[PDB]
Design a protein around this nucleic acid. Structure first.
Lengths: 92, 169
RNA sequence: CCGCAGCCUGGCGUUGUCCCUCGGGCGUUUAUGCGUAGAGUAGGUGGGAGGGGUCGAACCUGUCCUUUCGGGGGCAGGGGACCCGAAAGUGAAACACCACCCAUGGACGCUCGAGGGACUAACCUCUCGAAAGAGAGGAACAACGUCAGGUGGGCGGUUCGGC
RNA sequence: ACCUCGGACUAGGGGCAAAAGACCAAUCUAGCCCGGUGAUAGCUAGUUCCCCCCGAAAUGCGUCCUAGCGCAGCCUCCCUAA
RNA sequence: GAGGUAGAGUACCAUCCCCUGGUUUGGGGGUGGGAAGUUAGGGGACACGUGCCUCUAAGGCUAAAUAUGUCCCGAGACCGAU
RNA sequence: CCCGAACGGAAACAUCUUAGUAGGGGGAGGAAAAGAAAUCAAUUGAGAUCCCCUGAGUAGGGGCGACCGAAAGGGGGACAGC
């Protein structure tokens, strides 16, 4: 697909339809020392089999594409619903 | 208070260590268990109540460093309990020191212990060892408790200071 | 699917002393600096118009080194006492004193590397020696412990869909 | 490479095997005995007094699920409700 | 009022391992470092700082209050010779 | 007091749990152990330890799965401290 860089949509803080910056969604860094991460080593310490099952088989060819819009007039950022696509082209 | 100054030289670091290294070598020639007529660092022994009155004695012993001397299993086991590296003898070497030391002189009893030197291949400790059958200590008001049986062979059940330490009180 | 022995490598400890070339430093020892306009070496920021002055200066005369030989910096004697301005320029001035930074070199006690070498006193191997102790070769390595990584059906538990 | 006798040694995930997965006490694809341990069975057989009333299903969906279970439908018993 | 004493490879720290709820927080050990010590230290749920509160280890030793039937008295909705 | 299991459970099973029990080794006594806080908790309080009832399947742990599982306080017993 093709999507323009700027889309006039509603801004919750601006309480009307405003211009926005549109870009793909990117996951953040794993951010070690998380509670869900801390227990991993505390569960991996000692002797035993691979404590947590890990996925090895993959079925879906692609992954869901998500749109991220930022509200220029108030620096707000909104999170949109995902969708399955080949590759979301950001060219206007 | 010499005992205050004995470790003033040897508190954490002193060139005294070079001298002991010489003593360290000769002790390896000495038997793994032996008797020394006068205990080394009285600051500990007297701190454990040792009295130079007739009826006490000092013993030195050495042990090998490393993890636990545990065999690999052979039957059908789950991976959890079958690894080997990383094990360690749960009860401390300070504790183990008296044990073999205790067996040496069963007609006596153990009170307290400490190391005095240590290299990368051996640990060297010193242990108070008391005769209770001596007709001297038999009449002490200050240690009349020992006349009872229950004080015997204690180190094997871990009622010594090390045992209490191993139990983490 | 994996796990654990064993193996290979490396780190740490048992680990000592002389070093040796170089590259790093640690706490020190010191000394070396021109885009233009200008009395002229303003390298860049500070307190600072006072700093030096028998609590030794201006002047010129040489021995000497260096540099964009521009020019400044260090030598005592000849000279027994004088110069910079708060005054003229510079997007940024005082060779007025004392500080900080960049930057060049050597050295001092300590540390790490590219490493290399040497020794023996550790330790190891062997022999003699009743013991005690002695001698011979390697060597701060090796080996051990511990940790990590690579390998690892040598051994251990397991699954091996459904219609 | 004969045969055999007396003594002795090698222990089970081991021992021995001029090696057949053979033998190791009649027990050998992992010996025996005793203990974990009254282990595990979505399997198989049995389950015992009388009378009387009421009185089914063999279907749907889900399930490493079709020799079982969960939610339904199908039963009985009780109470309330008008 | 003045002065003095008051327990080291111990605390504590990093790492590996063990276990317990102890979890970025507990205790033990191995390994490596490693203190202060009265004008000391520790503790008061992640870390650090600040105040406030309470204890003083690294040595002892200890009456009773509970664990049990090899045994001895007593009692029993325990069985009557498979 | 050290060493240290599988069986099963999770409808599979490997982390986990079954479990520091079965069992090994050492050493006692008639009881043993432990026993005088580096204890708690929290408005500035209590005052050794032990066991009994609660606190409480609470806190908290874990493919957050089966499951595991405190403490403080209160209420009882004897309450001795050198």
């Amino acid at each position: 697909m093709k999507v323009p860089k700027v889309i006039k949509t509603y801004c919750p803080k601006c309480k009307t339809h405003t211009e926005h910056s549109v870009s793909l969604y990117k996951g953040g860094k794993r951010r070690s020392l998380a509670e869900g991460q801390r227990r991993y080593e505390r569960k991996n310490v000692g002797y035993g089999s691979k404590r947590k099952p890990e996925q090895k088989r993959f079925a879906k060819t692609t992954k869901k594409q998500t749109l991220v819009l930022k509200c220029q007039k108030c620096s707000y950022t909104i999170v949109k619903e995902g969708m399955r696509l080949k590759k979301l082209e950001l060219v206007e | 208070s010499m005992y205050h100054y004995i470790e003033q030289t040897w508190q954490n670091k002193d060139w005294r260590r070079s001298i002991l290294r010489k003593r360290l070598i000769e002790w390896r020639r000495q038997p793994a268990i032996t008797r020394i007529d006068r205990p080394t660092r009285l600051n500990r022994a007297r701190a454990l109540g040792y009295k130079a009155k007739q009826g006490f004695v000092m013993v030195r012993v050495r042990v090998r460093r490393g993890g636990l001397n545990k065999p690999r299993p052979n039957s059908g086991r789950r991976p959890k309990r079958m690894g080997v590296y990383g094990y360690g003898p749960s009860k401390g070497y300070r504790w183990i020191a008296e044990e073999r030391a205790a067996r040496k002189f069963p007609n006596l009893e153990v009170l307290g212990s400490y190391y005095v030197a240590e290299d990368g291949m051996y640990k060297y400790y010193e242990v108070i060892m008391v005769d209770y059958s001596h007709p001297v200590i038999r009449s002490d008001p200050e240690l009349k408790w020992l006349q009872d049986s229950v004080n015997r062979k204690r180190v094997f059940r871990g009622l010594t200071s090390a045992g209490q330490k191993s139990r983490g009180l």
